[model samples]
Target chain A: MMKAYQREFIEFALEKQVLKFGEFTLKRKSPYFFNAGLFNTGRDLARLGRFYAAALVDSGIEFDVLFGPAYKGIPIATTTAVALADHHDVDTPYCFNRKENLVGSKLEGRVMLVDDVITAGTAIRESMELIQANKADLAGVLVAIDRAIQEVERDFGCAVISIVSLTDLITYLEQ
Target chain B: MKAYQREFIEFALEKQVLKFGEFTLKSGRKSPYFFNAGLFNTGRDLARLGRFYAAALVDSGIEFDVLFGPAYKGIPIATTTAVALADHHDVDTPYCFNRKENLVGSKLEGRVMLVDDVITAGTAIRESMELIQANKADLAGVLVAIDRQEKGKGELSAIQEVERDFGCAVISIVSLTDLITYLEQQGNNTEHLEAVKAYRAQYGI
Candidate 1:
């Protein structure tokens, strides 16, 4: 059974057109595209942040810092940190990386990586490199959607959490 | 129970983002107190900081279509402030940020207000203004957490210089003057207050 927050998030994604179902080619008979960038308005982002916070709470991952990779991951990390504190009453430090240096707090302790989605997992790898270089453990990975194409756990030795998976979308569509 | 500005200062004090001490600044001047906005990395801290920014923007009466946060520091500030405006004030303003090379988030159009932590020399603010102008967008104004209120180059404070040069409004959640008032209200930090006043007297614009 899908969680309430996950169901609500998927519905919001559909409402915002961040998630759409159609005949799209992700190589093998996939049926949708999830574009996080479509969440442009302040309300959309604020709501999206809450969904990420719910996922983090559901995952039960203890993290010292929420690490968002530069560029795309910046807002996700910020809003997720906001949501965690505002809704879940969990105050967690969050930071992001610039191409040249770390942007926010010091990159240390068990860092939970937050991203919109995993494509080839290259961004996650780069984040892992930074976290490892800073001597921070990979607490876990959290994302908006899981394509489930990559073996993130086997490769990184950490569990990957997502608000909704491709399978969940498919199930929602069928329902 | 206090005003937003005073409440913000007290919040910073609790977070240790606002510290009173004897230390030298990057400008090679002795300082009595320091304000580090970067230490506000937690969710609650970001949420409150955003609300403060939103409140200041609403109070400034500056008309703008979008909030532009410059690279690095401004990204989170603008994002959270946008969130706060949407959640608290019911103003669903759009926000955008620039990467080192390309612009991300919303496209730059209409009047844009620049959001940042603090202005030292106002280089980043200038860069943001140039970007807005290049994209044919008007500069709404600039917003920051605090104003050091120190003169830059000439008689104008750096923020004053930005207004003078850019012909735009510059707003701060709190200024050095406000800090002094807050310190006075606390009444327990005469030594710290005296040091801050001396510093302000020496460098204040």
Candidate 2:
């Protein structure tokens, strides 16, 4: 029996059309796609935060701050913070990097990179650099799904957002 | 069809954020009304606006994965909506935004739902679509607070152009049609309604 929320998330993805089955050319050029980027509305966002918070609590990975990469990870990072407080009572501060490092966000403490997915771990790599640059510790990675999941090491946790590494993106090919 | 629109209207009027006196638009159009969404100032009002946006989406049942707000106004709007969705509707949605000069989001893909203030010229929306496509993502739809329901400078209304051009849905919390209907039904804003009706006749779709 899966955790109720995880099951609910999977069901919600299907009902919302975020999850699907079909062919998507892989990064190495293969066939099959299960995109998850489709969840993009007020109500959708509200639920997303709780997913992250739930994962954070379940993972038991001790971390201080949440670090989101520039542009993309900002929402996941911030809203997860909201969820941490509202759902888990973990009032952690979160921040994201700015392109050109223009936003001037200097963070501290053990930082967990919160994102929807961890593709090729490039975003996570970049986030690690940002977190380090800001004098923060990279506690690990938190993602919605585990597409190919990664081989990197002791810090990658997938909330299994719909079991897709989660980007309703699986929308494009998850036919 | 929408209970939230009426509530949104009442909230805006009460806050005087959606005024009906006189104001010049950035387009230089002399308008009888002014919709300064910025006037939903203060933390409480901001949170309130997000709840309305959440209510609108829940009521409409539109779906998408990532919330993409165009660079400028969409950022704060999208963030709050994300927050509201969680805080009020029990929905957790991921969101992202674009930068003007465009940096760093070379990193995301899939259907993007655009959120913002209103549709005037629709340039922001067009740019957003391009951004989504360039990211190798899909454009799920566009969400805004109000649909002017007026004609654009072109053959079609700005909203219509976006619809035709993108083949995506355009949603609004309150449309000009909705506003007029509310006014007409309530029997208030008589002078304002007449002016709005005339304006609609001249420029409405």
Candidate 3:
């Protein structure tokens, strides 16, 4: 069953062109003689976002809002919010964190800075604080890809969902 | 439709969320205001980006092989651009962007970093170029939210620099000229306005 799902994701990646094989270096200082970014076409983005939205619906995870981490999660979270509202008929407010928190009353609705991946889980922890500070419910964590092997599931005091997993992506590459 | 666009953009600005003050920016220019496109958090924003993208597409009259947004900022750009392309142009453009370094070599390939703004360094653009090249897609113009009209390492403005270097057209929803036009329409002070004009004369394309 997992293989089927993984194969579906692989085909999705291929269709979206999110997966690649080549020499590259990551921002985390790790070198990937071959790397994958999991970003596909716009249709794929909406489709992937919808997939997560479907998962949210299937899981029955109810929340008043959705948050995309700044710099990266903004698109995923925003599209997901739209999908949930349009597809599933759930209207959820979505926000993202800025690198530096702006001063004054403007900071009211802002959340934590988010990136594509969380290596140390520092961003996730800090983002949780921002979410709570903003008085927004931590609906759940939605990431395009999750890379941590053993740390696949971490307690963010909320549910977590990734459209594709690192293992799945790597396995696809091998084939 | 335009009314809705202006209303939401104005609300985004007025919430003190998007500030207009004499603040030093990353581009090293003393500007009267800063518009953070990221703050466009409502249905309005998605629509706004879509409209701007649609407008640019109409004006540019270019056909894209694919809609590519650099990972961090371009994600939304790619999404909205694709929507705009679909809605206004009847062209369904595919969108993609990068993941940050941690997932660098993992399974996510062709992840373009969706950049917020491209002012000083072209790191995002360079990375985006590589991704597009890797995917073997024909290069289309880059559509950015705002063009600061400031100088980069070279004498050219960031947009100009990109166009010159990458051989791809760099387009923006609003340039410094558009901002000045909006301000003039509002009948605001012409003092800083002249200063902006002068800066544009010095730097803008």
Best by lDDT: 1
**Per-candidate alpha-carbon RMSD to the true structure:** 7.0, 12.7, 11.8
lDDT of 2: 0.65
Please report how far candidate 3 places residue A35 from its true position, in Å: 16
**Interface C-alpha RMSD per candidate, 1 decimal:** 1.1, 6.6, 4.9
Arranged by TM-score, best first: 1, 3, 2
For candidate 2, lDDT tens digit of each residue in B113-192?
78888777678987877777777788878888888877778668888888888888888888777777877786557788
Instruction: Give the proportion of true interface contacts each model preserves, from 0 to 1.
Output: 0.79, 0.23, 0.29
Alpha-carbon runs more than 4 Å astray in model 2: A1-175, B24-28, B102-107, B187-205
Clashes within 3 Å, all models in order: 0, 35, 31
Model 1 lDDT tens row, A1-175: 9999988998999998888877876635446677666677789889989999999988888889988887778889999999988988888888888876687777788999888877626777788788888888888888888664357677667778888987888888788
lDDT string for model 2 (A1-175, tens) is: 4566666666665676655544545555423332334555546555666777787787788876666665556655656665666556675655566544522124666767776655625766766766666666667777666544445353333222322333333442343
Query: Stretches of candidate 1 above 4 Å error?
Result: A25-30, A148-151, B187-205
Lowest lDDT sum, 10 consecutive residues, model 3 chain A, at A102-111
| Candidate 3 Cα deviation (angstroms), residue A16 | 10
Error of 1 at B75 (Å): 0.6
Supply the DockQ value of model 2. 0.12
Q: What is the descending lDDT order?
A: 1, 2, 3
* Worst lDDT 10-window in candidate 3 chain B: B102-111
